């Protein structure tokens, strides 16, 4: 039945592979990447008229009938995204009179206008001189002086946040303004009678910081600031030391953009780091067939490749398949051997991790590392000298990365400090990098493939961690992939792989939960609204990925023979395309719970391929 389906899926995956041996599907986010890119261009005085057009077409193609833009396809209108999209469009050329402009603007005003937007949005506008700097929460360059164990020192923030902060402290220190041409000004964002609904810090605002902030803005107006220029340099240096091979910073857009702006403010426009940084942007840009152009929030080549291999190996391809060998060789050259920021909490730990993107040595992550090592373990490469070596290094690095509670975070160890979540500036997404169920599950499944079990202390501690984190209804929260189906799928398949008895009460309780959310069509679906509204838990339109996830949960838990199992397989067999792939008009990736969502192009093909390969084995 599914046999031919698997074959078609397999041959399709191989057609997607690049000549070098890796896989790389684009990463989908939301309109702000290009809206900010447009602003960035203006600031840097490098506007390409042609590029602006491809961006106009994109922003429009993304707008909905109501004239708004969302975070995820089918999601509620987002104020922030819509304001930035609007500002970009007005700058590009469109007048306030036009149909798209009107609808957008009316929604904006109905929300309290400019004053209801996140810090970033107001800051971007402040940069361009449309909003007053004194109303934007300050981040001083002096933050650079706080040592390692001191509260609020930069190493208490998550990887992503850290660089953004540093880069921004320089920008905030100078409060520069790049006036927009009179034609593109947006005073209309203030024109609203509706009371502004202000969003506070992610963990509730303390009056202390509120006071501290006001002090900072006051201090900002003094004629002299002792040790300021020295703090700026610390920030600049911190930046120059960590620039990525591709010219970015962390392989993500925020710090990369701010870094570039900071360098411009410092007259370093003709310095190598700037040059490289600017031209590196082109690699993250994508040309769309309808004449548009988008910008990727980040890139997933290592992730894609690693998962692809696992999918194909499970599908049935032999360990020495010449195609999977190219993949294997490519992966080996990707291993990081130098220390990174992580080394600040683990100085005696030997480097051996892997990053998400192509060239990002200072920020390897547990998720990627775990998958890669595991995927390597399943292969049969020519020089297993380097294969044995790489695995051991990756393995040991992961072990040494375990946190206090028994689980794992993405980039750092015990990045649990609660302090940062209360700052006035931090009103968008996660600011810290604490351990999570999914990263931990992936680590567990990695060790699992290596024969290790519940007997090993490392694993036990992790399992203890998972049992305590399990939701009342028996589900597991999805930190990096769209929710409970993601987490629960990852956890259960992990637990099985490490030797635990699938017969257990809590596991069965989860297994049952999966069956009770199966949609009529036979597949599973979970909308991004499940982070805001707990009613949407396990609810949403069926998707290839989310279906494949719940499938793996059941297959691992023994319920492979079950009805819900065969029913799901039908869904996949039927919904498959003639080329072998699947479609997925929905995002099943999570950036920041409730604030940022991602569309992992490859998930729709990779996961079902992996799930079916696993189903076939249960025979």
UniProtKB/Swiss-Prot annotation:
Pfam families, per the entry: SQHop_cyclase_C, SQHop_cyclase_N
Gene3D superfamilies: 1.50.10.20
E.C. designation(s): 5.4.99.17, 4.2.1.129
Phylogenetic placement of the source organism: Bacteria, Bacillati, Bacillota, Bacilli, Bacillales
Domain of life per record: Bacteria
Protein name per its UniProtKB record: Squalene--hopene cyclase
PFTB repeat locations: 6-47, 52-93, 232-273, 391-432, 459-499, 507-548, 565-613
SUPFAM superfamilies: Terpenoid cyclases/Protein prenyltransferases
Cited PANTHER family: LANOSTEROL SYNTHASE, TERPENE CYCLASE/MUTASE FAMILY MEMBER
Activity under varying temperature: Optimum temperature is 60 degrees Celsius.
InterPro entries, A to Z: Hopene-cyclase, SQ_cyclase_C, SQ_cyclase_N, Squalene_cyclase, Terpene_synthase_CS, Terpenoid_cyclase/PrenylTrfase
Pathway(s) per entry: Secondary metabolite biosynthesis; hopanoid biosynthesis
GO annotation, cellular component aspect: lipid droplet; plasma membrane
Quaternary context: Homodimer.
Listed PROSITE patterns: TERPENE_SYNTHASES (PS01074)
GO molecular function, one term: squalene-hopene cyclase activity
Function: Catalyzes the cyclization of squalene to two pentacyclic triterpenes, hop-22(29)-ene and hopan-22-ol (diplopterol); hopene and hopanol are formed at a constant ratio of 5:1. Is a key enzyme of hopanoid biosynthesis; hopanoids are components of the bacterial cytoplasmic membranes that play a vital role in stabilizing the membranes.
Summary of pH dependence: Optimum pH is 6.
């Amino acid at each position: 039945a599914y046999a031919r389906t698997l074959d078609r899926a397999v041959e399709y995956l191989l057609s997607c592979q690049k000549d070098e041996g890796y896989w790389w599907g684009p990463l989908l986010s939301n309109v702000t990447m290009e809206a900010e890119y447009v602003l960035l261009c203006h600031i840097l005085d490098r506007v390409d008229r042609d590029r602006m057009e491809k961006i106009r077409r994109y922003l429009l193609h993304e707008q909905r009938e109501d004239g708004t833009w969302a975070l995820y396809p089918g999601g509620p209108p987002d104020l922030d995204t819509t304001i930035e999209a609007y500002v970009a469009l007005k700058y590009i050329g469109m007048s306030r009179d036009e149909e798209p402009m009107q609808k957008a603007l009316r929604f904006i005003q109905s929300q309290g206008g400019i004053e209801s937007s996140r810090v970033f949005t107001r800051m971007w506008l402040a940069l361009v001189g449309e909003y007053p700097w004194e109303k934007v929460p300050m981040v001083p360059p002096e933050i650079m002086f706080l040592g390692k164990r001191m509260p609020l020192n930069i190493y208490e923030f998550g990887s992503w946040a850290r660089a953004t902060v540093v880069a921004l402290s320089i920008v905030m220190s100078r409060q520069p303004v790049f006036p927009l041409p009179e034609r593109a000004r947006v005073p209309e964002l203030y024109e609203t009678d509706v009371p502004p609904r202000r969003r506070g810090a992610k963990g509730g605002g303390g009056w202390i910081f509120d006071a501290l902030d006001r002090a900072l803005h006051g201090y900002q107006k003094l004629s002299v600031h002792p040790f300021r220029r020295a703090a700026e340099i610390r920030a600049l240096d911190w930046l120059l030391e960590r620039q990525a091979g591709d010219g970015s910073w962390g392989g993500i857009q925020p710090p990369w953009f701010y870094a570039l702006i900071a360098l411009k403010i410092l007259d370093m426009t003709q310095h190598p780091a700037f040059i490289k940084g600017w031209e590196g942007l082109e690699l993250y840009g994508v040309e769309l067939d309808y004449g548009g152009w988008m910008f990727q929030a980040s890139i997933s080549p290592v992730w894609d490749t690693g998962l692809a291999v696992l999918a194909l190996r499970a599908a049935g391809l032999p360990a020495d398949h010449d195609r999977l060998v190219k993949a294997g060789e490519w992966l080996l050259d990707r291993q990081i051997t130098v220390p990174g920021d992580w080394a600040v909490k683990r100085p005696n730990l030997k480097p051996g991790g892997f990053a998400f993107q192509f060239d990002n040595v200072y920020y390897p992550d547990v998720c990627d590392t775990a998958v890669v090592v595991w995927a390597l373990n399943t292969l049969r490469l020519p020089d297993e000298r380097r294969r044995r070596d790489a695995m051991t290094k990756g393995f040991r690095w992961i072990v040494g990365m375990q946190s206090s509670n028994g689980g794992w975070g993405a980039y750092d160890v015990d990045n649990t400090s609660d302090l940062p979540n209360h700052i006035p500036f931090c009103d968008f997404g996660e600011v810290t990098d604490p351990p999570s169920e999914d990263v931990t599950a992936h680590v567990l499944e990695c060790f699992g493939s290596f024969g290790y079990d519940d007997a090993w202390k490392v694993i036990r501690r992790a399992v203890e961690y998972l049992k305590r984190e399990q939701k009342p209804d028996g589900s597991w929260f999805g930190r990096w992939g769209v929710n409970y189906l993601y987490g629960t799928g990852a956890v259960v398949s992990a637990l099985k792989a490490v030797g635990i008895d699938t017969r257990e009460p809590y596991i069965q309780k989860a297994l049952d939960w999966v069956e009770q959310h199966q949609n009529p069509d036979g597949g599973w679906g979970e909308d991004c609204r499940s982070y805001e509204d707990p009613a949407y838990a396990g609810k949403g339109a069926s998707t290839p990925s989310q279906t494949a996830w719940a499938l793996m949960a059941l297959i691992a838990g023994g319920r492979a023979e079950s009805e819900a199992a065969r029913r799901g397989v039908q869904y996949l067999v039927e919904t498959q395309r003639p080329d072998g792939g699947w479609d997925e008009p929905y995002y099943t990736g999570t950036g920041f719970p409730g604030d940022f969502y991602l569309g992992y192009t490859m998930y729709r093909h990779v996961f079902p391929t992996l799930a079916l390969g696993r189903y076939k084995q249960a025979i």
